[PDB]
């Protein structure tokens, strides 16, 4: 069925940069929103990013505003999450998550913005650590 | 001595042009407007009179052309226009149980009942009415004109319409079974209204027409001229079975307030290409009769070949027609493929929604999809062939299906009709002097 | 015989069927053309009636005027004109000489009217 | 932000024993909440959506209930493959929130 | 009296007032309604006038004809028709017989016209 | 001995139908185009003439209905189209001196002259003109999902001025002057007239306003009383005055929605908001109902318990008295009138609802937005008839119940065209005489 | 002289061109306009013809009736009318008195009709 | 011993009203609907006939005016409407070789063929067609009144002649008498079925391509003592006027939508110069002398006749307008009427305008698309529309200023020779005749 696979994780220097990639399969990547969630060891999950099907309306969490940059390539059916100015607490297991439904139907300015979505499909999760 | 005398009401007529009114017994052609036809159409046979007819110079065909175009244009005005539909269409192929790669699945944004809200919908569009703008496509009509969505409540059934001349005019019907198309007719009759003329729209094959009386008839303005289309009329009908087993699903998309756009939702079941079946035995004997009649004009001991269309637009290179609302474009290369000296044929067909009727531009039309499997049976009662010349004719002649305009198509029905203006006034000598 | 049935028949014999021909003298796409054709037929019939009226032959199917026939219009016997020729052929023979005959009929009716007026006035 | 609280943080039960997990919302989120299950090392799987509709293909033993601010998941019989981490996500109003995470262990 | 004033009066009394009736026989929505109504009235008047003309009674309100009155139409005499009856019931009783009478009048006028032309020819 | 003779111009007529043109002394009916009616409408009596009339089979009512619809559509053709008005409305209750929550204050982003920008405007809409789509709340006009219609031009008035129907040459209109003549039957007193009397194209439901008056007594008409599905038309000999009004004192606001297009929105209400009502005298209505029940009892037989009840139910256009005067379309609840049973200075106040978007012709896909008008409305009129409907009644013949009816607008004008009928003049006639032609 | 060429000429000379004067009497918005003009001309001609028809002058351009000429209308001499005054001045002189003449001619033709019918019946 | 006699076909007529039908030999002024003209018009002269003509109460001018209105309205219907063009305009003065800074280089976001995609384009607009909303932002004129309709490029504005003919039963009387002042009896009258070729020209304050007089200049007015009524002047000789704009605008086709295109004004090749008109000083001087000579007869001798420019108002009446080539000019004619009379060429500055309201109507604006190449409009003046200003004879000096405000006066100078009449064939006269019983 639908399967999401990640890569690009690894050791990174504090204050440096890194990039994450998640490949989608089993569904039409150009019709479902994408989101990023991280799980730091010892505490619960914390949502950090999201993007629509068309690549616009990039909305992040206040704790990662500006530093991170979510982007997608519909042609290659892949998602990317550029990281800049990394810190120590950013060490976490990152999961790429696909919303429950498509973006079809009524919409105000961005397809799917008027619909409640939940992360039906999730990726295995890649542990990223930032230490010297 | 002789004196002139005025006679009123003499049976004298002169050729003239007039506007004949329609007559007939929820359809594109106005039915309520046409006056009810007489249940007992009178036909007076005239004896000892021969009239000269001319199918090519007949004004009835031109008037019918203008009336059909006018009715078609006015039939689209009271319903939905697809002007906002021109938008960037993200489209991909349809590979769910398919054997033909034409059909495409397009998604796009559209307006809704509210002006401040949009909607992302999808529709299945054929490759013929979709052109790539660069996985990005757009409609072929966006750079030409905004098509007007055909009314769904009206039917495209070609109901027969009788053309009746007004008072003071009469219609002469040539009953000569061997009419050659032009020239003197030794047997004419006066009729107030013509027979049922079904306005069937087709190219390269005259469907649901009038059959000949004795044998296959070939008519042409100039047999020796290659630029003049050769009309053929069959004495027996060649049954044709056309179908679309796709079983399309219609979905109403609220394009705007009070107006809806009918789109092709999904194709349930195996997708198969549309086609038409024609019995090869009947077609073989029919072509034999046609070549036998052709040899009468082109002489004997000449090989006659039947080849497909040379080239051009899809409307002229393929047998276009309407069947159950859907507009078909069938490739007739399998029929006109043979040479004459001394089981069923399946014709691949394609369907297009965005069409440009009457060979005009700027006034395109969008045929909405029809639910269910489409299937229809027609009678191939004629042909429109085009002959190509050669050096000293090289003892051979090649005929190809001619995609002539609609006047040639409608001329096959009005070949035995002509309008004449009555002239009741007449003066002749007689031996009588008016009393002072 | 019906409408235009005596068209192929020779002259004289067809003169007995003038009434059948005379009685036959009288969305928006099929409406405006119908109205136009009706008015066209009305003007044609009125023009014919006007011509008959000015010639003094109003309401007469077979009218006889006191105008001398000019032999130059057709060099043929009366018997052949009636028993071995049709009305179509006759119209085609004098298709160009009808205007002068129409004017001659008009002036002759005018002369007849003034003569009648003087006859009643003097008496 | 609409913070979410899940309890108990850990529960030990035997095979076939009923298990109940509850999680509250700091503000009313009506019924827009979905539950999940993350096995050790594998990706999470959706179990309940709309806080009451059962996800297609998941076994009928799983059941969700609750409305407003309090929601709860019930497991009628703990099967040998049911031990894993469970989450509860709220999606009534962005940003999304998730529970602290509760792990079920065999007694 | 005025228009249709003699409808209830007897046939004889209604014969002296046929002239008033004769004189009375001749945005976009109202425009087309008016034009269509005018055309219809003109066509009706012309049809009636042509029908009278082909009978030899053009320009005459009352005219005699050479068509004998067949007793099959009505087995009644002038006493109760011109003195104890109105035109309404008279037309009701002759709802269908008018066509035969019309045909007879047409043939009689045509035959009379030909005979008059022939009589003028002998003289 | 007897020869047939032809008579032209005889006084003979035959039943038929034709296109009767208008005649009168801007308006939606476009009365300016009608031919100027003569100051002395000729009317000739026909002594010893009896003609059979039929109000139900009369073609004049159908022709008038078609013509009225065509004129109304043509009148709305050059007016501004409110198609961009379909947007998400943020409505709130107008809790400012109200005694009812039937009015709402909505705000929305409407287009302007320059299409590249929008303008924030607000207007007041009645509860009947908006529907929730899920303390402000999203709303939508009821005609958005059905059909976007135009706005009635303010300069064009809806005053039902009378229009005279005339037949063309060769045709005649038979006016039945016989009093007490019911719906169908022979008329022993007929008179020919070139044009009909001034018929006011009044639009109303369940009651006839500004109509014709009965000659002597209240007249009850129907195809046959035995059929319960056939509407009953009643005509009053003495009319009852009816006074309708809305003391809200509405205000108009012109919003430039586009180039050359303006939307006449409803501004803020000045003063105290009061429900639109309508009054009818108690004594006059009681005596009128007495005459009506007397005639009904005469037709159905004495000792019949006649009862009057309000409308059973259905659409708002048929369950309430629809008005058309001044510019606003009222819907009065007539339950207070038909609330009496009969055996063997006070006034009745009828609550009325005002609706802007209307579908008065019972059609789907074509509506009309009536813009508000300045100042208070004082619509004084008089009732001259009713449209009643009788229920099944079962085998209990001892009592009968009547409720207001509708569903067919032609009945409104049918009460005015019951005296006329068009016929074809047959000038040709044949009769025997002793005369013959002379050779 | 041509159409309307005898307007300035005397009555005696203007009466010679009555035939020419009588013979010359016969987008969607533009189409309706043309039809309105055509039907208007047809209606005018038919009204004039109907007026002549009700009178005893149907089908005759020059026609005299039995209605006496009252001196009140005009006491001028015939020589100074037909040979000295034109038709235009004559129309402007008796423009208001034409209605009375029309009515007198109407009753006169009606009386002549009934007289002819009685004379033919007594035969 | 006199009896009335009925005469039919009597040659008598009278004033009446009728709907005349057009006739003629891709043209807004006249379409193919008009029936072909008569190759040999029946110009029948009427001797001893005198008719009272009147050009002010004539209905032919109003009827033809209504007809012209109908043609102009219908001609714009089969082509593109400029309703989405009313948007904010970022205009900047053109300074690439200029004297006259009246042109504005505007830019805006126009919708392309696809509804979901925009297009940034630029077009040159005259300052008369734009109005400030910020000093950088502009808006097209008439956007607050109606949506202008772009003129169909297929149809031209060339005034082909129009022959007005009366229907059956009616006739048209042509006043052949010379020195006719437009009112009163006409000694020489001739009847014709169709009027002469009337050029449907639109102009203000001066008449162009009209019919010249017979022997001398003619002054016409309802009555000279009233100033509220304009004065129509007709010249005996034509006054050649040459008009042209040195700038050859470039046409840019911008596809605003599916099957719709907006012809914007592109960059000007070479230097930019103001449009103007020329009129020979000698010809204009002698023409004004003749006009003053004719006016002296009406106002008496020893009077000071002065000429002054227009008083004031909108540009439609205060400037002289043309319709030739495609561009709508508005020229300041103050250089011509700047002289006083006691007892090499004149250059008239001119302006161009695209958005116009020709018939002075409200809500019926039109956009004139630009035309390629340098346009030359050579024509000649054949009349004037003057207005007199004065008081209670305070001083022996009468001042005349050009006028307008009524477009029908333009055609009034051409239809003054005709008058439609209705024929009355029926007639009655006494005679010594009596029908025999
Ligand atoms: C219904 O309407 C919505 C809008 O309401 C519409 O969504 C829009 O879709 C279009 C494409 O159809 C999007 O256009 C793209 O815009 C970006 C702008 O850059 C954004 O992203 C970058 C990187 O994330 C950010 O840095 C930046 O800040 C912006 O957020 C362009 O970069 C895209 O360029 C692509 O197309 C070019 C065509 O020439 C290519 O040359 C170019 O290489 C790009 O292609 C690749 O790049 C994208 C990013 O990697 C990738 O997503 C592409 O698939 C491809 O691999 C392009 O112009 C627009 O942003 C959308 N807007 C919103 C608000 O979502 C829906 O598409 C419409 N519905 C339908 C059915 O069409
Ligand atoms: C018959 O038609 C042919 C053309 O098809 C023509 O060449 C021939 O002359 C015609 N014969 C006639 C008119 O008798
Ligand atoms: C003839 O008329 C008389 C009246 O004079 C009447 O009594 C008789 O019945 C009539 N006969 C016929 C056969 O009509
Ligand atoms: C005009 O009047 C003169 C006067 O002598 C006369 O001779 C002439 O016949 C009249 N008519 C015409 C048409 O010239
Ligand atoms: C007119 O255009 C041509 C080229 O199209 C150019 O050579 C010429 O300079 C232009 N005219 C002027 C006056 O600049």
Residue numbers in the entry:
A (entry chain H): 1 to 52, 52A, 53 to 82, 82A, 82B, 82C, 83 to 100, 100A, ...
B (entry chain E): 33 to 57, 66 to 136, 148 to 184, 186, 189 to 309, 312 to 323, 323A, 324 to 396, ...
C (entry chain F), E (entry chain J), G (entry chain B): 520 to 545, 568 to 664
D (entry chain L): 1 to 107
F (entry chain I): 33 to 57, 66 to 135, 147 to 185, 187 to 309, 312 to 323, 323A, 324 to 397, 406, ...
H (entry chain A): 33 to 57, 66 to 139, 151 to 184, 187 to 309, 312 to 323, 323A, 324 to 396, 405, ...
The authors write:
Here, we report 11 lineages of V2 apex–neutralizing antibodies from simian-human immunodeficiency virus (SHIV)-infected rhesus macaques and determine cryo-EM structures for 9. Envelope complex structures revealed eight different antibody classes (one multi-donor) and the complete repertoire of all five possible recognition topologies, recapitulating canonical human modes of apex insertion and C-strand hydrogen bonding. Despite this diversity in recognition, all rhesus–V2 apex antibodies were derived from reading frame two of the DH3-15*01 gene. On the negative side, to penetrate the apical glycan shield of Env and bind underlying conserved positively charged residues, broadly neutralizing V2 apex antibodies must contain heavy chain third complementarity-determining regions (HCDR3s) that are exceptionally long, anionic, and often tyrosine sulfated.
Cryo-EM structures of 41328-a.01 and V033-a.01 in complex with BG505 DS-SOSIP revealed modes of V2 apex recognition similar to human broadly neutralizing antibodies PG9 and CH03, which utilize β-strand pairing of the V2 C-strand as a focus of trimer apex recognition. While 41328-a.01 solely bound Env with a 1:1 stoichiometry that yielded a single 3D reconstruction of 2.9-Å resolution, we obtained reconstructions for 1, 2, and 3 V033-a.01 Fab-bound Env complexes (Data S1-Fig. 10 c). To facilitate comparison with other rhesus and human lineages, we solved the atomic structure of V033-a.01 using the 3D reconstruction of the single Fab-bound complex, which extended to 3.1-Å resolution. 41328-a.01 and V033-a.01 Fab’s each exhibited asymmetric recognition of the trimer apex by penetrating between the N156 and N160 glycans of one protomer and binding a second N160 glycan from an adjacent protomer. The structures also revealed both lineage HCDR3s to contain an axe-like subdomain that recognized the C strand from a single protomer through parallel (41328-a.01) or antiparallel (V033-a.01) β-strand interactions. Two parallel hydrogen bonds formed between the mainchains of 41328-a.01 residue Y100fHCDR3 and Env residues 167 and 168, and four antiparallel hydrogen bonds formed between the mainchains of V033-a.01 residues F100cHCDR3 and G100aHCDR3 and Env residues 169 and 171. V033-a.01 similarly utilized two consecutive aromatic residues (Y100bHCDR3 and F100cHCDR3) to stabilize the aliphatic chains of K168 and K169, while also engaging K168 through a salt bridge mediated by D100dHCDR3. V033-a.01 could instead engage K171 with two potential salt bridges through D31HCDR1 and D99HCDR3. Although the HCDR3 length of V033-a.01 was the same as 41328-a.01 and just one residue shorter than CH03, its unique antiparallel subdomain was significantly more compact and did not extend beyond the C strand toward the trimer C3 axis like the other PG9-like lineages.
